[PDB]
Amino acid sequence: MMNEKILIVDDQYGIRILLNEVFNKEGYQTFQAANGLQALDIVTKERPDLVLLDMKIPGMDGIEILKRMKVIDENIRVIIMTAYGELDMIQESKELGALTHFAKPFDIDEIRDAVKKYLPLKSN
Q1: Where is the signal peptide?
Q2: Contact 4, 27 (CB under 8 A)
Q3: CATH number of the domain within which 32 lies
């Protein structure tokens, strides 16, 4: 316990400001990205333990991005965000290296709850 680097990977604007302000006051230094390529760049200059991959990006599937994250360090918690039902490679995704897979529309309460339950942060 002694760090809090998060990386929000996504292109659609809007949610990037929700996870930012929320993880901003809560006490988390999250960043912003888009193409998996960038997510890796910041992951190498920051090496965050929480990586959010949005499969709703208009370009490619982050599925491969994760494979690269775990390959670097199996001790890297990387969450995902896609359909909240049709499990398309979501059940196996975690098996490789993905805590859980949120979806949209999601609730800032369930997001700050799981994250706060995963990584430890100044509380009380």
Answers
A1: none
A2: yes
A3: 3.40.50.2300
